[PDB]
Amino acid sequence: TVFRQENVDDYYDTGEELGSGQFAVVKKCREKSTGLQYAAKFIKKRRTKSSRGVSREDIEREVSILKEIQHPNVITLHEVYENKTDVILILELVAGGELFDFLAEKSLTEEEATEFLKQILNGVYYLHSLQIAHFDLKPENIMLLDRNVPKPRIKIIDFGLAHKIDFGNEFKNIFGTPEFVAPEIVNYEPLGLEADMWSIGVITYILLSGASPFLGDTKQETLANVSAVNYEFEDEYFSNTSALAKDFIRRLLVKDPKKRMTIQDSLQHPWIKPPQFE
Ligand SMILES: Nc1ncnc2c1ncn2[C@@H]1O[C@H](COP(=O)(O)OP(=O)(O)O)[C@@H](O)[C@H]1O
């Protein structure tokens, strides 16, 4: 599929840089015709078949998935442009920064943690209902609308690894960040929606303790720890955390994805119910 090939600068003015990645830069922008503000994500295209940059197939998948999405806890896609060097996604602007940077700024109370977590679970419930595995859930990829309110609203971002799972598993290894990937990712096994639920367990552990449960001194050591389910609840961090909070995490950090809580399970859980190489 092809995208709008007019000069994006004819229709938008760009401002501050919001973030960077592996083959992408994200800049604040403003649409001339409406005055409304967005985040423009410039994704570098492949220069040759083999090659740096993102394959066209990968970009088209990300765009397809983004076009399906509309939910308060997920980013939305406004428009897509392209030229010879970049595909440019005009995304909904999320102005309150990453949950990652919020966590560095403030460890949270259980209430603060569950307020974020309920929103994350609602967003993932929506995605999984559409058979979309995000495959890159981590605090960097959960943005706040406004960081200066007592109960910030969040949106899930970064659909660069997301896949539609039409058979209950998919086989291509979709390897994210070692600290957050499930054992089946580490072991290059078929992957499904269950992989996101593991990442949610890791996120929850971090929200409650300020510490990463599998992190080693090298990426390879992290991956080994993940495959062996080498984590524990350090008394120093968790001695006054409720046993139900620990129960929630335990039921997500399970090696066998068939035995791991589903997104629907996580919403009925009593605590809730009201790149890889060195
Ligand atoms: N919609 C948005 N609103 C505000 N900031 C964003 C938005 N999308 C991305 N960012 C910022 O840019 C960074 C990189 O975005 P990302 O989608 O991860 O690109 P990459 O393909 O490089 O990983 C994010 O971690 C975040 O800081």
Side-chain angles (χ1 to χ4, degrees), residues 18-22 24 26 39 41 75 92 94 98 140 157-158:
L18 294 164
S20 266
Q22 202 166 257
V26 186
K41 177 168 167 175
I75 209 69
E92 180 179 17
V94 196
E98 294 168 16
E140 164 164 59
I157 65 147
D158 189 5

Side-chain angles (χ1 to χ4, degrees), residues 196-266:
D196 288 339
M197 299 314 298
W198 172 284
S199 300
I200 291 170
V202 173
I203 291 167
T204 303
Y205 187 109
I206 293 168
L207 287 178
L208 295 170
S209 68
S212 192
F214 299 105
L215 180 63
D217 281 337
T218 75
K219 284 179 195 168
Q220 184 272 325
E221 290 164 0
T222 300
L223 296 166
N225 287 163
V226 164
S227 183
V229 193
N230 190 104
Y231 84 100
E232 68 195 5
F233 297 111
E234 298 307 336
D235 288 346
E236 188 174 334
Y237 301 146
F238 289 92
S239 72
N240 291 274
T241 300
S242 79
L244 263 181
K246 294 168 151 200
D247 184 278
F248 181 85
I249 292 165
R250 284 203 228 81
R251 302 193 187 270
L252 291 170
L253 298 186
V254 172
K255 192 167 175 294
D256 184 353
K258 293 188 174 193
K259 300 198 158 153
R260 197 178 298 154
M261 286 197 296
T262 66
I263 192 66
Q264 296 190 168
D265 286 340
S266 74

Side-chain angles (χ1 to χ4, degrees), residues 72-89:
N73 296 123
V74 309
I75 209 69
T76 58
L77 173 68
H78 185 240
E79 272 201 294
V80 187
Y81 288 76
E82 68 176 331
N83 56 31
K84 287 287 297 316
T85 69
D86 290 316
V87 179
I88 308 132
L89 306 181

Side-chain angles (χ1 to χ4, degrees), residues 15-27:
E16 58 189 302
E17 189 160 307
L18 294 164
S20 266
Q22 202 166 257
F23 312 122
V25 59
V26 186
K27 296 186 174 165

Side-chain angles (χ1 to χ4, degrees), residues 34-232:
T34 62
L36 294 168
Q37 298 173 250
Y38 297 95
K41 177 168 167 175
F42 297 75
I43 304 172
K44 178 98 162 105
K45 289 177 172 183
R46 280 232 200 108
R47 281 272 179 79
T48 71
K49 285 270 173 71
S50 37
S51 185
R52 289 165 157 182
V54 181
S55 77
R56 195 169 180 89
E57 175 181 6
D58 283 352
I59 302 172
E60 290 171 334
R61 184 190 297 105
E62 177 178 7
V63 172
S64 185
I65 287 170
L66 283 167
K67 281 178 165 187
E68 304 191 14
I69 298 325
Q70 190 63 58
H71 185 279
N73 296 123
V74 309
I75 209 69
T76 58
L77 173 68
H78 185 240
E79 272 201 294
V80 187
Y81 288 76
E82 68 176 331
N83 56 31
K84 287 287 297 316
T85 69
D86 290 316
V87 179
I88 308 132
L89 306 181
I90 305 301
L91 303 165
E92 180 179 17
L93 176 60
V94 196
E98 294 168 16
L99 179 64
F100 179 83
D101 295 316
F102 183 87
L103 299 173
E105 279 148 30
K106 290 199 81 156
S107 185
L108 311 171
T109 71
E110 274 179 64
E111 303 282 31
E112 282 161 359
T114 58
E115 283 290 275
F116 277 119
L117 185 67
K118 287 166 187 206
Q119 296 186 74
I120 297 165
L121 296 172
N122 290 339
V124 173
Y125 182 55
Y126 173 81
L127 295 172
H128 285 197
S129 292
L130 289 175
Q131 289 304 116
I132 300 159
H134 182 278
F135 286 142
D136 202 19
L137 296 172
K138 53 182 175 167
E140 164 164 59
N141 288 158
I142 304 150
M143 301 286 305
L144 282 60
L145 276 193
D146 182 334
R147 93 168 86 202
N148 310 308
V149 305
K151 302 177 165 203
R153 302 307 164 210
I154 66 88
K155 280 179 172 261
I156 300 167
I157 65 147
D158 189 5
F159 284 80
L161 296 184
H163 281 65
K164 283 284 219 65
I165 312 298
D166 291 334
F167 302 98
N169 71 71
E170 68 81 52
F171 198 18
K172 43 228 154 195
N173 195 60
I174 300 160
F175 219 115
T177 299
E179 278 165 84
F180 300 94
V181 297
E184 57 265 30
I185 290 176
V186 176
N187 288 94
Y188 297 90
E189 288 160 348
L191 305 184
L193 305 171
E194 311 106 311
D196 288 339
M197 299 314 298
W198 172 284
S199 300
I200 291 170
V202 173
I203 291 167
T204 303
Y205 187 109
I206 293 168
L207 287 178
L208 295 170
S209 68
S212 192
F214 299 105
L215 180 63
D217 281 337
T218 75
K219 284 179 195 168
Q220 184 272 325
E221 290 164 0
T222 300
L223 296 166
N225 287 163
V226 164
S227 183
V229 193
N230 190 104
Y231 84 100
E232 68 195 5

